[PDB]
Specification:
The protein has 96 residues and is mainly α. Helices cover 69% and strands 0% of the residues. Helix 1 packs parallel to helix 3 and helix 2 runs antiparallel to helix 3. It is globular. It is found in: Endoplasmic reticulum membrane; Cytoplasmic vesicle, Secretory vesicle membrane.
Length: 96
């Protein structure tokens, strides 16, 4: 029942944009070194989808979260990384 506006802005403005830019760039689709790390991608997936599921998210910035989810899902599909059953079902609920 507490919140820091500055921390919320930090988590909703710059971090999401940085992740989206990193995972939706021409130099990232190659995944020369991205193949080694997949646990971090899974952790980002779960954290971001939980943040989306949180109801307090305002519509103004729910879009950035959704875009990040889509981008990371596209990266995961190409990388063929392992997914948890529940997380995969939840993601597929919105993929189509």
């Amino acid at each position: 029942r507490v919140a820091d506006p500055t921390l919320e802005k930090y988590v909703l403005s710059v971090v999401l944009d940085t992740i989206n830019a990193f995972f939706s760039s021409p130099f990232s689709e190659n995944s020369t070194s991205l193949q080694t790390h997949q646990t971090i991608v899974v952790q980002l997936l779960q954290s971001t989808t939980r943040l989306l599921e949180c109801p307090w998210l305002q519509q103004q910035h729910k879009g950035s979260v959704e875009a990040c989810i889509r981008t990371l899902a596209m990266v995961a599909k190409g990388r063929a990384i392992l997914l948890p059953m529940d997380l995969d079902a939840h993601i597929s609920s919105m993929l189509s």
